[PDB]
Design a protein around this ligand. Sequence first.
Ligand SMILES: CN[C@@H]1C[C@H]2O[C@@](C)([C@@H]1OC)n1c3ccccc3c3c4c(c5c6c(n2c5c31)CCCC6)C(=O)NC4
Length: 598
Amino acid sequence: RVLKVFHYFENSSEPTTWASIIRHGDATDVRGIIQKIVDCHKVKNVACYGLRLSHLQSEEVHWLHLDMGVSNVREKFELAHPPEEWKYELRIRYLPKGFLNQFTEDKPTLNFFYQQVKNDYMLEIADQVDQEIALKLGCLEIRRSYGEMRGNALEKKSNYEVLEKDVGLRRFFPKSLLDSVKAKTLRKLIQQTFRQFANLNREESILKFFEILSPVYRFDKECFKCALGSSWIISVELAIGPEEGISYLTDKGANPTHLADFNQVQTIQYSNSEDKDRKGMLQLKIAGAPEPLTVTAPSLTIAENMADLIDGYCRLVNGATQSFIIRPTDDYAEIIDETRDYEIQRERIELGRCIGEGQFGDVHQGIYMSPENPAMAVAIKTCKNCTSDSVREKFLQEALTMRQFDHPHIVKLIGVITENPVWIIMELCTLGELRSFLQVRKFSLDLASLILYAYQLSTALAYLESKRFVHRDIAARNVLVSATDCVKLGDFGLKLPIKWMAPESINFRRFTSASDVWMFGVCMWEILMHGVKPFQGVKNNDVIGRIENGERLPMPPNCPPTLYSLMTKCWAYDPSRRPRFTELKAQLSTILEEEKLQ
Ligand SMILES: CN[C@@H]1C[C@H]2O[C@@](C)([C@@H]1OC)n1c3ccccc3c3c4c(c5c6c(n2c5c31)CCCC6)C(=O)NC4
């Protein structure tokens, strides 16, 4: 059987669903699980990660000791409540002494840690933190998250808006702040506190983040109210952490008193309050001290959680692998990840000459003989590492989307072959890629033709808008020519094409219809420029630089100055001032009719 573990390693997905799915074995212990997830992310500080299980509708928490066997941990807890309501989440619990410093030379771990701490901050105290503090914090998460954007970006109404109204400032700030200040002024406050963190890369952001939190949120330890002693039980707060070891403080803030270091800890033992109540009993034998250090915790659970803490630490301080808690092949651990009419038998396909390359698989020419009906020329997108299953599942995911579309300027899906290697069968656009097509025919195509193509493209992009489908890569490279008077739209699958991208795409990784329109502008230029690439001989940074300053692509010779202004309307920095697709359709329609009559 399997297991889902939520963790804090980044993904362009939503943070609340970052997880790994492990096909564990029957004697597999929590070590196995942790090991295989962190090896899977190139983690150097393995000894610092633990596993914490908690029910959804409950606020209490269960630390799963390394040596426990998963299936009989399922067994135990899944006998209380269903697997649907339990949350297994990987956490850092065991800080080395220089921890922050040390995690700098372990990039995944610092990132994991930062996220895990940032999550808690939002969830636990963000609402009731100082106004200046919240502000300062939020900005660094902008700064860190959106690496490739230049500093002065947030002093642009459109940019800020994209954060306000598309991204959600809630991703950076508590509902408490956003509510209690007028939004137009909030815009200032951010632009302002953002100045101080203008030129800070991802690494420094994270540390400046921590630096500003630490004074107002201890994440460098855990505390437990509990009682010390074996007979005259006396009430204390325990602090357990890297620069203090086990410490009692009481009180108030003041100096914490040292009790032992983790390297002193001989053995751990815990048990149910054999006495009247329900309390946790915890015993620690220490260096040469003949009497065990005896802790009474409010519940057996807390006791267990405290043992996990102390074990983890010991097992870390000593370069140790086995436990310090005295007790009363199949451990395989694989990493995995989570219908059709239109089936075609492979024997009904003659696989012709390879026609285009794939970073994923080649595209081929082909004959398709369908029993009822004559032969048909088809394109065939092939798969190379097709046996590796999710790569397969993502490949023929593309075919699923193409099922949905039916429009005369989108390349029609014809079928799939759902056995390795997976094949996607589509129509073949005989006259090839548009760029090539244009260069070749630079002197035999009337203008009415060139803009006809943009018109047809726009009808397609309109159709796609109408189904809320963003394409992400509109360019003449993704257009094919199916006949003299007819072009079609290309890829629909999953080294950035900087020069065609809208600014918010280069800045905030945002991809909307409105980003699509910008690219379509550049596409339109390419067409009118008979298949030349935008910005020949300019490297990408000067381009983002020029785009940022106001420079645009010049009017191609022969472009009706109306159409050229439409292109620049598509190149509106603020994505909301850009035309709609349904609108560029209507316009080009007329701009064509006018061109037809000459
Ligand atoms: C960079 N442009 C390539 C031109 C070439 O190969 C590619 C990879 C690319 O076309 C999107 N290609 C596809 C890629 C992904 C899905 C479908 C196609 C595809 C298709 C065709 C095609 C053709 C060419 N290329 C084609 C195609 C070169 C000239 C012959 C026609 C085609 O006719 N139907 C799908």
